[PDB]
Design a binder for this molecule. Structure first.
Ligand SMILES: *C(=O)CCCCCCCCCCCCC
Ligand SMILES: *C(=O)CCCCCCCCCCCCC
Lengths: 163, 163
C-alpha cells in the first residue's frame, strides 16, 4: 500500500491553524509549548508503527538512530533531510540541523512571544516515536530561524535504553 | 524554488490533533464543523497564492475550474486525484469523488458524532481559494467514508462570479 505524496503547503498552514487555536486557548506561550509537545508525543507513538513498516531498522546504537531519523524519517514525513552534527564525545548527544523547516514556511513570530517554540510538536514526535523503540530521549530546540538564527537546531539527548 | 514533498502521515495525524483540540474546546459537533470551515477559509485565501505560482490557470468557466481543482490542486496539496462526476444540466454543480481522503487515514468516528464533518476544513479551503479567483462557491460533504459510504463526496455549487 503506497503512501500518498504531497506538497507541504497545506500541512504547514494546517499546523499554523493548530498553533493559532492553542494560542487562543492558552494565552500563555509556555503552555502552548507543552501542549504542542504532548500532542507531538501522542503522534509519535502512532507514527512509529507506520515508519517500521516502511523502513528496515531495529535497535543498533544511538548513532545509527541519528542517521535513520535525519535521512529516512524526516525525509519521509517532512520532505527534508536535516544534517547531523556536534556529537558529544560520549556519543549520547547530537544535533539535527534544519536549514529548511516546512512547519515555519510563511510564518513570522509576533514580538514578546520569544518563549514560544513554534515547531515544538517535533520534539514530542521524536520523543514518543523513540520511546516505542525502547529509547528514552530528550529533544529540544536550541536554534530557531523564527528567532533569527541561520538554521533551526534540535538537540537530541539519549537518556536511557528502556528495558 | 521547488516545494518539499512529503508523505501524508504526519499531516493526517496533525490534522487529527487539531480536530481533537477543537472537540475539547467546543463539545458541540456543529461548532467544530464551523470552526473547521472558518480555518479552512483562512487557509484557502493564502493557499491560492501558492497555487497560481505553480499552475498556469486564470478564469475560464466552472467546468475548467472543476478539472483544475481535482487534477492539479488536490494532487499537489493532498497527493490524490478526486473524480469529477454528476454535473448539473446547467453546469453550475459537480461532485468531487474522493475514493481515498488522507485526512481520515487512521480515523474512526465515535458514536453519536454523526453531525461531525471530520474533514470539513476542505470545504473552507475550497471556498476561500475560489473566492480569490472571483468565484463564489458552496462546498459541502454529502458522502463520507467515516459514515460508511463507499466514497467521500464533496458537492460543489457555483453561486456567482465576483466582479
Ligand atoms: C534504529 O536502528 C533506529 C530507529 C529509528 C526510529 C525512527 C522513528 C522516527 C519516526 C518519527 C520521526 C518524525 C520526524 C518528522
Ligand atoms: C481557473 O481556470 C481555475 C482556477 C482554479 C483555482 C484552484 C485553487 C485551488 C487551491 C486550494 C485547493 C486545495 C485542495 C486540497
Amino acid at each position: 500500500t503506497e503512501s500518498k505524496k504531497m506538497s507541504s503547503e497545506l500541512f504547514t498552514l494546517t499546523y499554523g491553524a493548530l498553533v493559532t487555536q492553542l494560542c487562543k486557548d492558552y494565552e500563555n506561550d509556555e503552555d502552548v509549548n507543552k501542549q504542542l509537545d504532548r500532542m507531538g508525543y501522542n503522534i509519535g507513538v502512532r507514527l512509529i508503527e507506520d515508519f517500521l513498516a516502511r523502513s528496515n531498522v531495529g535497535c543498533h546504537d544511538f548513532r545509527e538512530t541519528a542517521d535513520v531519523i535525519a535521512k529516512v524519517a524526516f525525509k519521509m514525513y517532512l520532505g527534508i533531510t536535516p544534517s547531523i552534527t556536534n556529537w558529544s564525545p560520549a556519543g549520547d548527544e547530537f544535533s539535527l540541523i534544519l536549514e529548511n523547516n516546512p512547519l515555519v514556511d510563511f510564518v513570522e513570530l509576533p514580538d514578546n512571544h520569544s518563549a514560544l517554540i513554534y515547531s515544538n510538536l517535533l520534539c514530542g514526535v521524536l520523543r514518543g516515536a523513540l520511546e516505542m523503540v525502547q529509547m528514552a530521549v530528550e529533544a529540544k530546540f536550541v536554534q530557531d530561524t523564527l528567532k533569527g538564527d541561520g538554521v533551526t537546531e534540535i538537540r537530541m539527548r539519549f537518556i536511557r535504553r528502556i528495558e
